[PDB]
Amino acid sequence: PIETVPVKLKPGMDGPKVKQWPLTEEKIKALVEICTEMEKEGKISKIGPENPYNTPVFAIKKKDSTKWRKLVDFRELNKRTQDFWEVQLGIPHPAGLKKKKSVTVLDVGDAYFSVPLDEDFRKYTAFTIPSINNETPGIRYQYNVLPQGWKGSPAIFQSSMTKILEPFKKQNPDIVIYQYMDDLYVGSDLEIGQHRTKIEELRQHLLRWGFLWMGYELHPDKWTVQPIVLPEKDSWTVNDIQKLVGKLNWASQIYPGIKVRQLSKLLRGTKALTEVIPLTEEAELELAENREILKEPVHGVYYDPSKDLIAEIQKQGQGQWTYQIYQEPFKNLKTGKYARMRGAHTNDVKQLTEAVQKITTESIVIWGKTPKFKLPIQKETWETWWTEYWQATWIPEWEFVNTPPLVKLWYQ
Amino acid sequence: MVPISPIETVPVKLKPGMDGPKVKQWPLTEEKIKALVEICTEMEKEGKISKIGPENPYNTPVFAIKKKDSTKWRKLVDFRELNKRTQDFWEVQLGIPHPAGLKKNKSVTVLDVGDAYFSVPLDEDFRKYTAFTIPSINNETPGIRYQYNVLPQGWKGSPAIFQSSMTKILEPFAAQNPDIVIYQYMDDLYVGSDLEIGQHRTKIEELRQHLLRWGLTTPDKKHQKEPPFLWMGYELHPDKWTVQPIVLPEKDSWTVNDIQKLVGKLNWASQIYPGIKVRQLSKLLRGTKALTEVIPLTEEAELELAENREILKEPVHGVYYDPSKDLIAEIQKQGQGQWTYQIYQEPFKNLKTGKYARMRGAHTNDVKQLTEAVQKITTESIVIWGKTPKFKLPIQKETWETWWTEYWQATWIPEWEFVNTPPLVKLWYQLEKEPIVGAETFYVDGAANRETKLGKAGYVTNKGRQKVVPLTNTTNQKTELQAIYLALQDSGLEVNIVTDSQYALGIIQAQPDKSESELVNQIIEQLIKKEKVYLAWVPAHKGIGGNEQVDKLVSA
Ligand SMILES: Cc1cc(C#N)cc(C)c1Oc1nc(NC2CCN(Cc3ccc(S(N)(=O)=O)cc3)CC2)nc2ccsc12
Numbered sequence: 001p002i003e004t005v006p007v008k009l010k011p012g013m014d015g016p017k018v019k020q021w022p023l024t025e026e027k028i029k030a031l032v033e034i035c036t037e038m039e040k041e042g043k044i045s046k047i048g049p050e051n052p053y054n055t056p057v058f059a060i061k062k063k064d065s066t067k068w069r070k071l072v073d074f075r076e077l078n079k080r081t082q083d084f085w086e087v088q089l090g091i092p093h094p095a096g097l098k099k100k101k102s103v104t105v106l107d108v109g110d111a112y113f114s115v116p117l118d119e120d121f122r123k124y125t126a127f128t129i130p131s132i133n134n135e136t137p138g139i140r141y142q143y144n145v146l147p148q149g150w151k152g153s154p155a156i157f158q159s160s161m162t163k164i165l166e167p168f169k170k171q172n173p174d175i176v177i178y179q180y181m182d183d184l185y186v187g188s189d190l191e192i193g194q195h196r197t198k199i200e201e202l203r204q205h206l207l208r209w210g211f212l213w214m215g216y217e218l219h220p221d222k223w224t225v226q227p228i229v230l231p232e233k234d235s236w237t238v239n240d241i242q243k244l245v246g247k248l249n250w251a252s253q254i255y256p257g258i259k260v261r262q263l264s265k266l267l268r269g270t271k272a273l274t275e276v277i278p279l280t281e282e283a284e285l286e287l288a289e290n291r292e293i294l295k296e297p298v299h300g301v302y303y304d305p306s307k308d309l310i311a312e313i314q315k316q317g318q319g320q321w322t323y324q325i326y327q328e329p330f331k332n333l334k335t336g337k338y339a340r341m342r343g344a345h346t347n348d349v350k351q352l353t354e355a356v357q358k359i360t361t362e363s364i365v366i367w368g369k370t371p372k373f374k375l376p377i378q379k380e381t382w383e384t385w386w387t388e389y390w391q392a393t394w395i396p397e398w399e400f401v402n403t404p405p406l407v408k409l410w411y412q
Numbered sequence: 413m414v415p416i417s418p419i420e421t422v423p424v425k426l427k428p429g430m431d432g433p434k435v436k437q438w439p440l441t442e443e444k445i446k447a448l449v450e451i452c453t454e455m456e457k458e459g460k461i462s463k464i465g466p467e468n469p470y471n472t473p474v475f476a477i478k479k480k481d482s483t484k485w486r487k488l489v490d491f492r493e494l495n496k497r498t499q500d501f502w503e504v505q506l507g508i509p510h511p512a513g514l515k516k517n518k519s520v521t522v523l524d525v526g527d528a529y530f531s532v533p534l535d536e537d538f539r540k541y542t543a544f545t546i547p548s549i550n551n552e553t554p555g556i557r558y559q560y561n562v563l564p565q566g567w568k569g570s571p572a573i574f575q576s577s578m579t580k581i582l583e584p585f586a587a588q589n590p591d592i593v594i595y596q597y598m599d600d601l602y603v604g605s606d607l608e609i610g611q612h613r614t615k616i617e618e619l620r621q622h623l624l625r626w627g628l629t630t631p632d633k634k635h636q637k638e639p640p641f642l643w644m645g646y647e648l649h650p651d652k653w654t655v656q657p658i659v660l661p662e663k664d665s666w667t668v669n670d671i672q673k674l675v676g677k678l679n680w681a682s683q684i685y686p687g688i689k690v691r692q693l694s695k696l697l698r699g700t701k702a703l704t705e706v707i708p709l710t711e712e713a714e715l716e717l718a719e720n721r722e723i724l725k726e727p728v729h730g731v732y733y734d735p736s737k738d739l740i741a742e743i744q745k746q747g748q749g750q751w752t753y754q755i756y757q758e759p760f761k762n763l764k765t766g767k768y769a770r771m772r773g774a775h776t777n778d779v780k781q782l783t784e785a786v787q788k789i790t791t792e793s794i795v796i797w798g799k800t801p802k803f804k805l806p807i808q809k810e811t812w813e814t815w816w817t818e819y820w821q822a823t824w825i826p827e828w829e830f831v832n833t834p835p836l837v838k839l840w841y842q843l844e845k846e847p848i849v850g851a852e853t854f855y856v857d858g859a860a861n862r863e864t865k866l867g868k869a870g871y872v873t874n875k876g877r878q879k880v881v882p883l884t885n886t887t888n889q890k891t892e893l894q895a896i897y898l899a900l901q902d903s904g905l906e907v908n909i910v911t912d913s914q915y916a917l918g919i920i921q922a923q924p925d926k927s928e929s930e931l932v933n934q935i936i937e938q939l940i941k942k943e944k945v946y947l948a949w950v951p952a953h954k955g956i957g958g959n960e961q962v963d964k965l966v967s968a
């Protein structure tokens with residue numbers, strides 16, 4: 001690939017100028033080693049002071065890998081980079097991917113380093129390996145090839161990728177292969193024995209076209225919107241009924257037809273919270289009718305690709321996390337719950353960080369893009385620690401929730 | 413002739429779509445012109461500038477200035493216009509090392525790189541934009557026109573390009589001499605090591621031999637400064653560091669300007685003088701732009717000042733960093749949202765100290781502030797030392813475990829241990845998860861008229877206790893909090909409370925222990941006195957008994 005594809009920023013926009021955040025000594029040392037080898041290989045070059053741009057960099061470890069990896073946070077550059085209709089008008093997101101029995105994620109970002117980056121665009125990929133205590137000026141580099149994590153790379157590389165894969169595709173017409181940023185998502189309906197074979201047959205096929213050896217295994221089998229469920233009880237206290245009426249009142253914003261009149265009737269008077277109330281027949285019927293309504297899908301839920309996906313997350317305690325993805329309020333496109341997050345039984349922020357990556361992975365499989373997160377955490381705590389648990393090569397956007405939502409109870 | 417390597421040129425551009433400057437040269441006296449001609453003739457002989465013909469259309473004004481006793485003229489080329497039109501550069505880092513992150517170098521030499529500076533060539537394609545004109549005597553001949561071949565002092569790119577050029581030249585020497593440290597500050601190159609003075613002098617000679625490859629002569633700095641080095645507001649001694657003298661002035665009359673300089677001195681001092689406090693002195697600046705407005709000091713600002721004077725009566729010093737020892741950070745609560753900390757490796761030998769002040773907020777609690785202080789110190793430590801310290805915190809392990817397991821937000825603090833240094837951070841109340849058997853149930857409500865601002869707040873209970881209080885100059889939100897307050901006031905030590913106020917729930921669920929609202933504060937004080945409180949929420953206007961009744965009592 002000698003010819004470079006011309007790339008520009010969006011009209012009227014300059015390059016990114018994002019501060020490098022401070023890094024631990026071990027991460028700095030790892031980045032120095034990685035970047036020295038990349039410079040020897042010609043992938044990056046030292047830059048001079050006439051380049052004022054910057055994108056932050058840090059170091060991670062992929063899931064169960066002891067080797068440090070460089071992660072550039074290209075979020076600002078990506079939003080400033082021209083929109084891409086690379087080879088066509090767009091790849092309609094494969095709706096069948098989320099239906100496959102198993103989906104394997106392969107890191108193919110290494111392929112990007114074989115394509116040269118437009119010489120006039122390189123300056124915008126500048127990044128700094130910082131020094132400790134400001135004791136030396138940072139080490140300043142820019143990219144000479146397509147960088148991992150940049151919006152342009154999959155777009156510019158897509159012609160090369162579609163050709164690399166065609167013989168495999170022609171042979172396995174029932175396997176879905178979808179690319180998002182540095183990752184390939186390979187789904188089929190076989191048993192892991194055959195699927196692993198295919199996956200190993202694909203990376204071998206990739207190795208003969210010029211890898212990593214890692215893989216993530218997903219089962220989008222039952223990704224849906226979790227029903228609202230109401231308690232089934234033989235004796236209701238005043239408190240139980242108050243909680244039920246509150247939950248139903250909330251559900252009524254989602255579902256037409258929810259009624260609470262007959263259940264409220266049970267609370268006639270000023271009763272002790274722990275007093276047992278017998279259900280009348282009218283209230284039993286009303287609750288049964290609400291129960292039936294909640295079994296149906298929500299009305300008028302549809303994905304609109306011109307709108308952001310929103311993800312909200314609630315800490316439920318005891319390592320459990322609930323979440324909803326939507327574009328408009330009360331129109332959930334997907335809901336879910338996680339428990340016993342791996343390797344963080346004593347660390348809230350690690351658990352939250354892993355939930356954010358799992359949800360982002362689900363969002364890429366279902367819609368082909370990442371959601372904007374509403375995180376139940378103070379900004380200063382999140383910003384101090386999330387990079388310490390990040391293991392993905394993309395990074396989504398996020399905002400912070402400082403007022404406790406009443407709805408955590410309803411997803412409880 | 414000994415061949416020398418050229419210094420790599422930095423390519424420079426004007427900002428997009430902008431042209432170079434075209435600023436008219438001012439008239440000058442015959443005296444200043446003679447002075448400028450002499451100066452520029454000498455600069456021209458040294459290669460710094462070159463005469464140019466009349467084709468160049470750019471121009472920057474030049475001036476001639478004096479000094480009090482120094483009885484010679486100075487040249488001044490005013491590049492402000494060109495600076496506005498020059499591209500941005502990766503600037504010399506605004507950040508400087510913090511002394512507590514430095515490590516011992518027993519031997520230090522200061523080289524003068526003033527002369528090396530003029531070997532840095534200016535990008536040939538950019539020189540045209542630096543044209544200037546010496547007006548001629550009596551304006552009877554064409555003015556003498558020059559441009560720069562070297563980095564003009566006062567031009568926007570000169571510091572970044574000079575620094576980058578030196579760094580690139582020094583880099584191989586630094587990497588092949590890992591036992592020395594090199595730090596540049598304008599015309600000063602500081603070269604340090606921990607070697608015996610003989611081996612150190614040799615490295616300095618080797619460095620001079622290295623720089624000669626570019627034709628650079630670097631002699632020692634004139635009038636070698638004895639220790640300590642006066643650097644960036646510090647005193648750096650071979651084995652210790654402090655700030656330069658902190659002298660708080662005595663005054664009968666303090667203006668808004670006087671208090672600003674006081675906080676700045678105090679803020680500078682707080683990186684080594686433990687326990688400095690600036691809240692009560694900062695509260696005297698809240699909202700004011702007139703800097704001579706004499707603001708009388710509160711008895712609490714006087715106390716604070718007097719307390720800082722006591723802390724500042726004697727110099728204290730910090731130690732430098734030892735990578736072989738642990739890094740420990742200890743925090744104390746000072747009150748009124750203020751926190752102090754020490755970072756050290758050995759007991760009683762601080763690397764540095766610091767402080768942290770509560771963020772502006774309607775409500776807050778001590779555990780949240782302590783967490784924020786931890787995150788600040790964490791980030792400062794990564795900056796200075798490249799690692800997180802072990803923390804010593806005035807909060808019991810069991811208190812922290814209760815907090816984070818029950819708090820609605822994710823929260824984390826890194827490896828830490830309890831230090832029993834009052835006052836301790838604690839949880840002042842915890843609400844129940846389930847309704848209390850045998851505790852009276854208060855249904856509370858309040859409401860207010862948006863126009864008249866008249867309201868009511870009250871409750872009804874399962875024992876037939878009831879209260880409605882008429883209120884003036886109030887709001888719905890305020891009456892809703894007032895209702896909860898009345899129920900707390902009038903109940904036993906265990907109480908179930910039912911509200912429909914989403915506003916009140918949102919406040920109380922945030923677990924504040926202090927507020928800017930006296931009413932919230934009064935509710936917190938009531939909560940602290942209870943043994944058990946269950947707070948339950950119901951939707952308004954849904955016919956829920958108890959709630960419906962009290963809603964009527966307070967809605968007119
Ligand atoms: C070399 C240097 C000097 C100054 C000044 N002004 C500032 C900085 C940032 C410097 O840069 C670095 N300084 C160090 N350590 C320090 C440790 C403490 N001392 C003070 C001292 C020692 C000995 C004598 S003495 N007996 O020779 O008179 C006098 C004064 C200076 C060196 N480490 C690094 C690492 C990367 S840069 C850098």
Ligand SMILES: [Mg+2]
Binds near residue numbers: 859912952
């Ligand atoms: Mg009401």
